[model samples]
Target: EVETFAFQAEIAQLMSLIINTFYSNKEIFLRELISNASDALDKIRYESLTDPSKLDSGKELHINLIPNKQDRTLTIVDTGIGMTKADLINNLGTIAKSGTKAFMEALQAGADISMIGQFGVGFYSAYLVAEKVTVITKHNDDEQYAWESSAGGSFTVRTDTGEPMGRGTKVILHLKEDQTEYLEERRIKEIVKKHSQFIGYPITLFVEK
Candidate 1:
């Protein structure tokens, strides 16, 4: 079952700042999210050995990148540990983390904390290039839900009627006009190799027909 959590105020501010004006390498957002997906797959894989049922429920542990040119949307979908409403808010809306603040503070003080990616802060960086983001996920023991946010204000969370992938998460980035560069397979492939080739999971891009 998915548990509940709260986000602290300071952490929320940190999230806002990071999404608005942090990350020198914005393109790395894709890499970081993919990395997180890899970690999720690893987590479940370890758990599945003890409880074989996990394998029956979206245990493929793979990543897929789908680009929609007509809608200007880029989706990063993964068969990983799907989140609940509480997990979504704490992870995305607020920092709700321990080391992230210290890392940001150090960077502000001109210290190179470039190695600090202890949190999922990197994934949220997609908001820098996307006007709106839709996260549709399904957990093994919970109902599927959709979390929508437009960096300008609050986020909305609701149940999803769409067919669940049985497990894992899907993040659909509504790319801004200037950020359509992510739609190109060549660019995405280069990025996957550059930052995620060493990732412990298989990452694939769905080439369009």
Candidate 2:
């Protein structure tokens, strides 16, 4: 009963992202995103292991972060791989449910997490910094699609005519008024430096000047 601090309005609801994550850093949102990007790069590399044709996409393995001020948006790019429609829907939409309990239960028995590499985060995925999230991606084998979300627990995957990147995944974060501090390239750089200093691929920041 000492001092109980609480955030008011929509800020409080965002606690879901901070409180129940596998990583324990409040500023880890970008870091986890880079991890997800690295996982995507690793994915295509893994897929090509069986069939060399998967390498035909030919995008170099890298991660990028771009900040747009007037748009109030930050786009995270992955030069790894893309998700098919089914994979996009089932993976990002229900990640909160499957990424936790089933994960621990699997660890209790089978040690091989071969299949768990897809969804890179736990219950709290990308709800921390952005009010709305859109993923536009084109796969080596599948067509392009944009998966979007801005509500409590509902996400939509729409077929995109064309946009974002040539191949691989591009995550667009519609930054909220409060979190637009992430809109500055230096802030993004600091965020990356502080949290994901050792992230797998080279992190490219598209600085607008």
Candidate 3:
């Protein structure tokens, strides 16, 4: 049955601390998100190296940035390693790699903001510019699932009823009132070229009509 899980005390604390802490500036949210996407692609590629049948035979490996000005949404879709329900809980809830405790300590000690690197929380950076975020993903080992949160101390995940993503993750960011700049194709290009020009994979941006 689909239900909601509240973030533990530790996870709740960390989420509140990291909310707008790491962003420093909003534009880098895209950069951090794309970087994580690249990492996900790399993970699947490495797994496929050992077993030629690991990937979906001919699934393309790439990242796509689709922007919808009409809806004020920006979606980053990747043909990379997707996550299961458990993964969504851990990756988004916990600090990824048990960094929760350490992260808390750093916050108390006034550690440098760069300390955010300790975990895979880069995914949460989306909240910097998004009023809400939705993840639609499918992993080879599990069925498709949808995860959504407004960073209100908890999140809900359930089986996805939409078309399957084939194999990868699709992250949709509902732009905040003051973050409409992200919906501009020209703005995304500048940000991508500035931060992701050297990314190993290709980044295709959907142009406005």
Candidate 4:
């Protein structure tokens, strides 16, 4: 069963600014998402160094990009440290850092919000091109779960009944009508080669000839 949660007043407005004002440089969406995935992989790998039983034992760290032109969906998958129910609420619900909140406040106050910082706001950047975003994830500490939002104001979190990814996260971007460019194999490869070629993890793109 899925439950809904509303965004805070400040957070709602922040989402608006991101979705409305950030489309000019929309390709950053993939870069930011991949960067976050890489970070998650790094976190789990580091944790496993001390506690070897952490995530799925010896799970290979890799990122996969699968594009479905028919459904107009772009799925980014990563074998990383997945999120629990509480992690979803805390990390995706509220601003993870007070500093990020302050920066967004500045944006609402008419100052330009720069993309600089250790803020976790990168996830919301997906809304720049995706009409809806669905996250399916599983952590070692909890069962598989799904979190979805249309970037409209509120989001829903639910227990996923589908087969689990074992341990990792899959972010599915329901690309908007005008954002179909992201579904192109050549374009996706170009973006990955340009922005994330030197990225830490190997990124596999599933594209048909």
Using lDDT as the measure, which candidate wins?
A: 4
By TM-score, the candidates rank as 4, 3, 1, 2
Better of 1 and 4 by lDDT: 4
Encode model 2's per-residue lDDT on 1-209: one tens digit a residue: 11112222222333343334344233456776788888889998888889988777774889889888888888888878888876765544354444544544664585333333343343134565677888888887687888776645455667787654667888888876777778887787888887788877899999876
Give the per-residue lDDT digits (tens) of candidate 4, residues 47-146.
9989888854446999999999889999999999988898887665555556458767766676553362346677777888899999999888798999
Candidate 4: 10-residue stretch with minimal lDDT: 110-119
**For residues 72-143, what per-residue lDDT tens digits would candidate 1 score against the true structure?**
988998888788766776655444455667667766777542344554466656766678888898877788
Model 4, residue 41: C-alpha shift (Å): 0.1
Better of 1 and 4 by TM-score: 4
Better of 1 and 2 by lDDT: 1
| lDDT by candidate, in order shown | 0.74, 0.67, 0.80, 0.83
Q: Arrange candidates, best lDDT first.
A: 4, 3, 1, 2
Stretches off by above 4 angstroms in model 3 are 18-24, 91-97, 104-115
- TM-scores, all models, native as reference: 0.85, 0.74, 0.87, 0.90
Q: Which residue pairs in model 2 clash with each other?
A: none
Q: Model 2, poorest ten-residue lDDT window? A: 1-10
Model 1, CA-based lDDT: 0.74
Candidate 4 deviant stretches above 4 angstroms: 55-58, 95-99, 105-118
